[PDB]
């Protein structure tokens, strides 16, 4: 088929790159202590650290292991007021992070807490 | 006790269907079959096992089949290597093969 | 693989006891039993019974109870999978009757239901 | 609403703080070889290691990502007799860890083969 | 019961160990610069980056924190044309490791877009 390899979607349209998040998933994390050892030391301890940051919250968010996990918070349009056909067959990811970048922070909220809620339903429906 | 079939053959292209059989002391359904192709005089060789379970390496026109009463050995599409003596034998997990009279094909 | 060499086809004469060898491999020794079967001229093909290279335990037929010694010696690691074992055979009141090709024929599996059934054997040895 | 912050709740009842999970699970994961370094540095490997070990429990119980997750280990009232208003409308967290502290092992081992039972029944199911 | 121990059913048929994987599983994971401290900082260092390894393959597979995990990728028997019985009741984890070595980067891409295929199927039904 394709297989542009590691971010070679980057420049394609956010729906085209939403079909290849292995490729960019699976790099993501692949002693004396001397001037070079050091600095290798320093690009492993980096790597676990964001890798893990990253799992964290694809963990509060009920995401984990999940390169597509949809949510319950809707779409407040002051984020983003384009179409889904002006979004995902226009823009791409990089350009879109770019206009979306202030309200990151606010929707990381959101999901974080309709996670906690959402398994507090879950256990008070398995309490029959 | 465990009476197998007198003889019988086919030709090349066609089908054999031997039987085995006996009382409840070694058959049927509390019990497994296997059948064995054995030259006379000769290394012999386990065709299929459990009923019906083919070993390693048998052609699948070798077919199992056991009843509530009598346990069957399906020779499909005959070859000249199959002139040789089969012996069906019953056995469970935790006992020996009590093997078959023989039947000439 | 695997191979199970036997002795050689040598005759005695009624009241003797005579020992059948039956040597191991490419397999490991230990892993399988080691059953005895006997094709006689004048009767079926009778199993006499089967010995554990790994437990010691034997489980003979009553038609041989007590007429039948089943010993094995412990194996000779060659690599991780590879072993050479040895298989020994018995008689106690022996007559001419007993005449037939023996054969040594080890385990077709390791655990299930047909564990000790006799799958591979051996070259078989002529008796009196 | 309320929102009292890490280990906001550390004071209140287990209901109360069973419902500010996330508080507490987001603030558990967020070169120079000098007296500082080597200080800063320990702090970084140590902090994804007790991460890790908590996230690796949570695995083999069947508890991937999830906050509030149920089991099917029964409660063996030897660990405590409480009952469920005078547990969570009465004691904290805290305490009911130092009278749960000498059964926490225990529990520990009945949670991980109950899992790894499930998974196996799980296979069997779809098998078909 | 049995409890053969970390590794103990190392030596064990593939379907008898596969009944032990908690115990194998829970054995992944668990500062002064001096010679010994040096050592034992790269000891943590590379527990956590060899445990993290196996956990992101098994997330880009659908198997997050899951011991048996079943797939959609059918068995090409070009990798083994063994039968199951002579497989789980026969044959033991080392040794059929040692015979799928050469299949097992195949057999990780197949379970790679199969759960990156999976995830765009389920948005797709979870769409209505
Ligand atoms: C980089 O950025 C560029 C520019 O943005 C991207 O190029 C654009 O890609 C998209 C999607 O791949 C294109 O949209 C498609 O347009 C085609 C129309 O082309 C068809 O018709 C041509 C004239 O009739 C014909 O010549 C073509 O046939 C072959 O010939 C050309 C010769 O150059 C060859 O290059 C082609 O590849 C063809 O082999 C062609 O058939 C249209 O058919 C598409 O519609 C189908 O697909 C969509 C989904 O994509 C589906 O929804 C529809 O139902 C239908 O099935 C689709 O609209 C666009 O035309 C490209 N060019 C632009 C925008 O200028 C490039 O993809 C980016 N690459 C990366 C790696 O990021
Ligand atoms: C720290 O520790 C202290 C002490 O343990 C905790 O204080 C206790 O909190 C619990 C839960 O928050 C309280 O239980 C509730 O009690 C109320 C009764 O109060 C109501 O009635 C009063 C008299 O009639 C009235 O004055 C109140 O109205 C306001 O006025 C006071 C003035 O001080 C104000 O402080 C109040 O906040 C009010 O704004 C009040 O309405 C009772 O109504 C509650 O029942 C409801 O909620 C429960 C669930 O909580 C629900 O199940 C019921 O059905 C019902 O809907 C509830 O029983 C307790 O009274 C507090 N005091 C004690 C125990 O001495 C404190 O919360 C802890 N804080 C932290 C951060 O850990
Ligand atoms: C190391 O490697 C060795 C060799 O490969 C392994 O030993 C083999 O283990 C398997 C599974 O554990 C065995 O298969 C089973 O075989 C029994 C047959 O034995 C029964 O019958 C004997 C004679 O009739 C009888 O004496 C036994 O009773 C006791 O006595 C012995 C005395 O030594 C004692 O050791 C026994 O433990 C008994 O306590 C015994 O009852 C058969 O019954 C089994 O079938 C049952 O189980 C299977 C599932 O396993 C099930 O599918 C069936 O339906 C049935 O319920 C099973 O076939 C094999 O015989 C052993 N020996 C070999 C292969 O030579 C050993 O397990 C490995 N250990 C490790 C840690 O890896
Ligand atoms: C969108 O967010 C703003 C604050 O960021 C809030 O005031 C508003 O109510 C929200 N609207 C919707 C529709 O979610
Ligand atoms: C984000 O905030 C900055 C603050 O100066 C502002 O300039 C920018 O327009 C904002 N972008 C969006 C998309 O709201
Ligand atoms: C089998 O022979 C050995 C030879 O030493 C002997 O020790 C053993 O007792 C014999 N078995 C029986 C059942 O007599
Ligand atoms: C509780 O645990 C003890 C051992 O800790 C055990 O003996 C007892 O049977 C258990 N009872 C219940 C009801 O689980
Ligand atoms: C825990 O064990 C200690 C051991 O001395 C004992 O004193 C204490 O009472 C025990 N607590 C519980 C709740 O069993
Ligand atoms: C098995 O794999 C080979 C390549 O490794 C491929 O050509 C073949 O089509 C595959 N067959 C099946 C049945 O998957
Ligand atoms: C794996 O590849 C090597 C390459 O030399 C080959 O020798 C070996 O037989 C192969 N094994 C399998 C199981 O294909």
């Known amino acids: 088929a394709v297989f542009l390899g590691f971010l070679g979607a980057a420049g394609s349209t956010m729906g085209a790159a939403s079909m290849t998040l292995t490729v960019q998933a699976r790099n993501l994390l692949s002693l004396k202590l001397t001037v070079w050892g050091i600095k290798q030391l320093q690009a492993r301890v980096l790597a676990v650290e964001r890798y893990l940051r990253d799992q964290q919250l694809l963990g509060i968010w009920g995401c984990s292991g999940k390169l597509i996990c949809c949510t319950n918070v809707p779409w407040n349009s002051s984020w983003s007021n384009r179409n889904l056909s002006e979004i995902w067959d226009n823009m791409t990811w990089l350009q879109w992070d770019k206009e979306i970048s202030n309200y990151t922070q606010i929707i990381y909220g959101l999901l974080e807490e309709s996670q906690n809620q959402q398994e507090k339903n879950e256990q008070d429906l398995l309490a029959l | 006790v465990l009476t197998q079939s007198a003889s019988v053959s086919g030709s090349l292209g066609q089908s054999v269907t031997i039987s085995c059989t006996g009382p409840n002391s070694v058959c049927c359904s509390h019990k497994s079959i296997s059948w064995y192709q054995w030259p006379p005089g000769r290394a012999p060789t386990l065709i299929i096992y459990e009923d019906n379970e083919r070993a390693p390496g048998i052609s699948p026109r070798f077919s199992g089949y056991k009843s509530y009463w009598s346990a069957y050995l399906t020779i499909s599409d005959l070859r000249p290597e199959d002139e040789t003596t089969y012996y069906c034998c019953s056995y469970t997990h935790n006992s020996g093969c009590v093997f078959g009279t023989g039947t000439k094909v | 693989q695997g191979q199970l060499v036997q002795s050689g086809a040598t005759t005695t004469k009624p009241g003797s006891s005579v020992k059948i060898s039956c040597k191991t491999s490419?397999?490991?020794?230990?892993?399988?039993?080691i059953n005895w079967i006997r094709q006689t001229a004048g009767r079926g093909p009778e199993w006499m019974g089967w010995?554990?290279?790994?437990?010691?335990?034997?489980?003979?037929?009553?038609?041989?109870?007590?007429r039948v010694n089943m010993t094995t010696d412990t194996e000779v690691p060659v690599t991780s999978f590879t072993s050479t074992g040895a298989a020994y055979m018995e008689i106690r009141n022996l007559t001419s009757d007993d005449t037939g090709t023996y054969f040594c024929?080890?385990?077709?599996?390791?655990?299930?239901?047909?564990?000790?059934?006799?799958?591979?054997w051996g070259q078989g040895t002529l008796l009196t | 609403a309320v929102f009292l912050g890490f280990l906001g709740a550390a004071g209140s009842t287990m209901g109360a703080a069973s419902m500010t999970l996330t508080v507490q699970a987001r603030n558990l994961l967020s070169l120079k070889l000098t007296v500082w370094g080597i200080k800063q540095l320990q702090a970084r490997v140590l902090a994804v290691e007790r991460y890790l070990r908590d996230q690796q429990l949570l695995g083999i119980w069947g508890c991937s990502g999830k906050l509030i997750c149920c089991t099917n280990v029964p409660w063996n009232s030897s660990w405590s007799n409480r009952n469920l208003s005078e547990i969570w409308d009465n004691m904290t967290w805290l305490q009911w860890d130092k009278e749960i502290s000498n059964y926490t092992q225990i529990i520990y081992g009945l949670l991980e083969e109950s899992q790894n039972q499930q998974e196996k029944n799980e296979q069997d199911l779809l098998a078909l | 019961a049995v409890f053969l121990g970390f590794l103990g059913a190392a030596g064990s048929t593939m379907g008898a160990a596969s009944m032990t994987l908690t115990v194998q599983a829970r054995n992944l994971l668990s500062l002064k610069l001096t010679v010994w401290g040096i050592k034992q900082l790269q000891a943590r260092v590379l527990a956590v980056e060899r445990y993290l390894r196996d956990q992101q393959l098994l997330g880009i597979w659908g198997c997050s924190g899951k011991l048996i995990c079943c797939t959609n990728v059918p068995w090409n028997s070009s990798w083994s044309n063994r039968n199951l019985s002579e497989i789980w009741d026969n044959m033991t984890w080392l040794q059929w490791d040692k015979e799928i070595s050469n299949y097992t980067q195949i057999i990780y891409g197949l379970l790679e877009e199969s759960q990156n295929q999976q995830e765009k199927n389920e948005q797709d039904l979870l769409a209505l």
């Open positions: 010995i554990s290279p790994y437990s010691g335990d034997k489980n003979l037929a009553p038609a041989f109870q007590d």
């Open positions: 490419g397999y490991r020794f230990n892993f399988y039993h």
């Open positions: 024929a080890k385990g077709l599996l390791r655990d299930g239901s047909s564990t000790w059934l006799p799958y591979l």
